[PDB]
Design a binder for this molecule. Structure first.
Ligand SMILES: [Mg+2]
Ligand SMILES: [Mg+2]
Lengths: 72, 171, 55, 67, 55, 98, 104
RNA sequence: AAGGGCACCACCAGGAGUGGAGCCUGCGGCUUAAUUUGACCAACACGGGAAACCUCACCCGGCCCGGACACGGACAGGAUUGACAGAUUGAUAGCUCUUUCUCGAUUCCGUGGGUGGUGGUGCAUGGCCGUUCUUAGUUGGUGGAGCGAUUUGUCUGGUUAAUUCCGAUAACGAACGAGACUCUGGCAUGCUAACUAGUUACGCGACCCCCGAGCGGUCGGCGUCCCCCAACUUCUUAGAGGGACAAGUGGCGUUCAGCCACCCGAGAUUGAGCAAUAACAGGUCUGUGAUGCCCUUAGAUGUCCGGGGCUGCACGCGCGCUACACUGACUGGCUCAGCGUGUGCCUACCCUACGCCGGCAGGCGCGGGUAACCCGUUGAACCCCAUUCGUGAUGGGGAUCGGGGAUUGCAAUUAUUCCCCAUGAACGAGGAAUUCCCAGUAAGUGCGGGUCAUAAGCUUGCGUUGAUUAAGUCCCUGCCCUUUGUACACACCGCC
């Protein structure tokens, strides 16, 4: 990825790693009392963004943008 | 290996061989009820099995024409003497084969039959030989400058989606 | 016709060095993967070669 | 069209008769006034052509002139 | 005078052929052979060298 | 057309050693891939077998870029009387160990 | 010996490649030769984006032709001689094999 | 002609633009021997068409027959083929002339008959492709209406992306198309496994330390399949499976089809591919040893060679790129990708690490790689951090042009490309008009592939940063259905 995507992946990776380690070795009762704060702050801190990208079509410069057409 | 070629180029070269072999066999056995072909390639040898309707005609007198063909392929592609084999096998229920009917109707039209008569005969052959549906389109000009398209359809046909690849056979 | 000039002009390179392996045309030739095929010819023989338009 | 130059006439050979460039005297003596190109692949049967100031074998047996 | 300055026809449906038209006409009503149908149509060398060259 | 006698007899004896012969359609090919040491370009192969076909001695099949000349029976007899061969020599495709 | 060989499986249809990988592993267990799992190389994607039309006129329409090459490696090990122990191909058309020495 | 419906190739509200400048490139025109040529929503960065030769189809010159085969002549006392020298030609085309050799039935001539042609005809055709249209439309069986063609089914209405469904209903039940389907995207700490992907643990180190961290910190340093000398698949690869279905709730709705809101969930509309009955005298004979017919066929519209040309400019048009600046340019530093290619039957042409020389383009020797092994942990740009500039057509802009140097090629002039020092042109946000577009989308921003001996401003992909506006309508423009009119049925390019 890039700079932004790396940073976002890192911060969600930290939250997911701590919450999973806490759930693995100590009680999930106290895992919840930090998981609730994480999600109610930002759900992306625990749930990855499903959107990646859209393929380019042969009708324009990009995914949906189309080249200029002119009639005259 | 440096003497060897890349695997991607290898598969491309194989398909080139299959396409050219199919076209040459088509133009050679067009009248002999040609239907199709397959190849099994092993390090020991490569085998060519030609599927046709009339194998007794594809064979030469005491296999002369098959000997004729099995040499001319090796001479074309630089094959080993003992590692190229040529076989002819008949096609089961040829009424289901798009190519075999296409060649037969080609001969019938060369015979000069009425187009409606010839197409109805082959359509009847396919339908009574077992098929959910069959459809033949004949385009071109006859007895005039203007061209026409004749469509002879019965049964059921599909046109969209993946199933059209392994259900509807074209020629 | 005379041997000195019948093939004197080289074609070691360029567009005239390469031709389609089915029809000998020199326009719209695909050279990728060692194909060396006129493009209309390739669209004709793609199924036999093994190329499928998955999407 | 309208080509200004004229139709170039191709070379026509003389349709020469027998070779006869070597004779016999005193009731038969092999004598040649022609040269032989002595190249091994040229052979010993071939006779060099005679010219006013050079000698040229029928094959590519070089060409020796008088410098 | 039936075309524009380049040569594209000003009337595509004005059939320029005296024999045929925009439509295809079945000669003799689709009768006879070599024509479209009708309602009634509906109802060893190496060893030889070895012995030649030995002497 | 203009062919040396060694070239015609070498090409012909190749078409009788094996009943078939292929040839890439290239008049400018300096040497045929077969019979390279006879030093004859592919053009002489082209014109000779197309002249055999015109006479009625060989059947021509053409795929993408190669010829597929098939010797006929009249081609077999015509080659024998041209090369002075006895009525026992045959190509491989005609007979093999039988 | 102590001999070990790497058979490389390359194919264009996954179902056949998975089938050959199946009965070769099954043969390996039958000969009780220790075998590593078939490792899968990333699939090669041969793409040709040619134009659909044979002429110049059209709406600039393109055809995306694909060719998937799937590759696999199966490793056979044995403290005894191996090549004489297994002389079986068990192959079908559409898939090719090449066995190499693990040392070389 | 009327009524319904749909659509960012329509609008609304917005975004970025084009039209304004320079330049690349494509048409029309002008000139020329030629500036080869098709095409005028659905032509005009299209013919994968980025042409020095070739390509090449055009123009000026010059070779060859590569005119099979049949017949008649000429012929081993010669049918004939090449050829060093000199002229002659651009030519080392014996093309032609003087010159004699040499070749030896293979040819030469004449009569027919081939053949070839990027020659003409796409308004003679196949195939392919585009468009109407990728909108939702198309057809049987049985039954009803009819004397009949025919019609109902295929509909007032609600609904949906959709004759998609639900509903009234002389119709019931189907089939194509839509869907369904295949591929692709996101999730499985679930299974299967990997020295061509690796991860934790450990053993040596190297450095930081030592105030004391010492179960201290960094290591893309070395090892633990160097095979007995650790485990494992979380990360990578890719198979088999699962997973989402309007399933739960609430509200609206005939309470039906459905719509909206919310919890839980990875996902509550991921993109494509395919695609009906038919029509466009739509585009292609210049894709084809696809092709009918016509033209040409030895002074060749066959074919080769050489040179020019496809670029040529009083002008108009289209697609674009570079900018008009401080949200910036320059200088330096820090610094994270993903597609995917890579050594050739023809075919002589590969991606390249390291080291050295050069300022650069480059040059030299060793390597590696037919590839998850090497390039490559693809150290990309944008962006980020500091310095300078300072509203000045200025350190923006890099057009035009001069000089010099390298790579490729047989050949660089009409400049191939690239590098350096010069000059610094218009252009200060662009009229009437006009294009594209709803979420990782627009837009900026690089990198691959195709083209390639040399090379992208094109195209096709990939990734990075990443929003504003809307969840509606028929006002405009188009398209579809129903009704309506018809003297049209070759069907309005009609009839008259
Ligand atoms: Mg669908
Ligand atoms: Mg300058």
């Amino acid at each position: 990825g890039g700079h932004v995507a790396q940073i976002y992946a890192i911060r969600q990776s930290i939250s997911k790693a701590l919450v999973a380690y806490y759930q693995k070795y100590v009680d999930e009762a106290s895992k919840k009392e930090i998981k609730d704060i994480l999600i109610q702050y930002d759900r992306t801190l625990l749930v990855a963004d499903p959107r990646r990208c859209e393929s380019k079509k042969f009708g324009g410069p990009g995914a949906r943008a189309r080249y200029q057409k002119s009639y005259r | 290996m440096a003497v060897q070629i890349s695997k991607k180029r290898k598969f491309v070269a194989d398909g080139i061989f299959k396409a050219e072999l199919n076209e040459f066999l088509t133009r050679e056995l067009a009248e002999d009820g040609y239907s199709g072909v397959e190849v099994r390639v092993t390090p020991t040898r490569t085998e060519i099995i030609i599927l046709a309707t009339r194998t007794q005609n594809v064979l030469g007198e005491k296999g002369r024409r098959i000997r004729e063909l099995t040499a001319v392929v090796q001479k074309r592609f630089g094959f080993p003497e003992g590692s190229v084999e040529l076989y002819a096998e008949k096609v089961a229920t040829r009424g289901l084969c798009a190519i075999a009917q296409a060649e037969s109707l080609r001969y019938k039209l060369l015979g000069g039959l009425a187009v409606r008569r010839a197409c109805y005969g082959v359509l009847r052959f396919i339908m009574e030989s077992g098929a959910k549906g069959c459809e033949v389109v004949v385009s071109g000009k006859l007895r005039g400058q203007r061209a026409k398209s004749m469509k002879f359809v019965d049964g059921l046909m599909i046109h969209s989606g993946d199933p059209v690849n392994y259900y509807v056979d074209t020629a | 016709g005379h041997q000195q000039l019948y093939w004197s002009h080289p074609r070691k390179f360029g567009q005239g060095s390469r031709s389609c392996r089915v029809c000998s045309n020199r326009h719209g030739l695909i050279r990728k993967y060692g194909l060396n095929m006129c493009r209309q010819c390739f669209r004709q023989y793609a199924k036999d070669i093994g190329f499928i338009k998955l999407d | 069209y309208t080509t200004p130059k004229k139709n170039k006439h191709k070379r026509k050979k003389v349709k020469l008769a027998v070779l006869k460039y070597y004779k016999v005297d005193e009731n038969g003596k092999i004598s040649r006034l022609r040269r032989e190109c002595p190249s091994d692949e040229c052979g010993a049967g071939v006779f060099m052509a005679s010219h006013f100031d050079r000698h040229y074998c029928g094959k590519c047996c070089l060409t020796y002139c008088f410098n | 005078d039936g075309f524009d300055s380049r040569g594209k026809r000003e009337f595509d449906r004005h059939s320029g052929s005296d024999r045929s038209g925009l439509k295809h006409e079945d000669k003799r009503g689709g009768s006879g052979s070599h024509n479209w149908g009708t309602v009634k149509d509906e109802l060893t060398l190496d060893e030889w060298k070895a012995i030649q060259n030995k002497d | 057309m203009l062919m040396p006698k060694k070239n015609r007899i070498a090409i012909y004896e190749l078409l009788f050693k094996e009943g078939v012969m292929v040839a890439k359609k290239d008049v400018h090919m300096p040497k045929h891939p077969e019979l390279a040491d006879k030093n004859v370009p592919n053009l002489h192969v082209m014109k000779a077998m197309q002249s055999l076909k015109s006479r009625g001695y060989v059947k021509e099949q053409f795929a993408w870029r190669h010829f597929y000349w098939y010797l006929t029976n009249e081609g077999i007899q015509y080659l024998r009387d041209y090369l002075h061969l006895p009525p026992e020599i045959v190509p491989a495709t005609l007979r093999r160990s039988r | 010996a102590i001999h070990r060989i790497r058979i490389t499986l390359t194919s264009r249809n996954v179902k056949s490649l998975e089938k050959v990988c199946a009965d070769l592993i099954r043969g390996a267990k039958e000969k009780n030769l220790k075998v590593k799992g078939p490792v899968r190389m990333p699939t090669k994607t041969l793409r040709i984006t040619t134009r659909k039309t044979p002429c110049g006129e059209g709406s600039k329409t393109w055809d995306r032709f694909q060719m998937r090459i799937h590759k696999r490696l199966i490793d056979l090990h044995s403290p005894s001689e191996i090549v004489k122990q297994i002389t079986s191909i068990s192959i079908e058309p559409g898939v090719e094999v090449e066995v190499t020495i693990a040392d070389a």
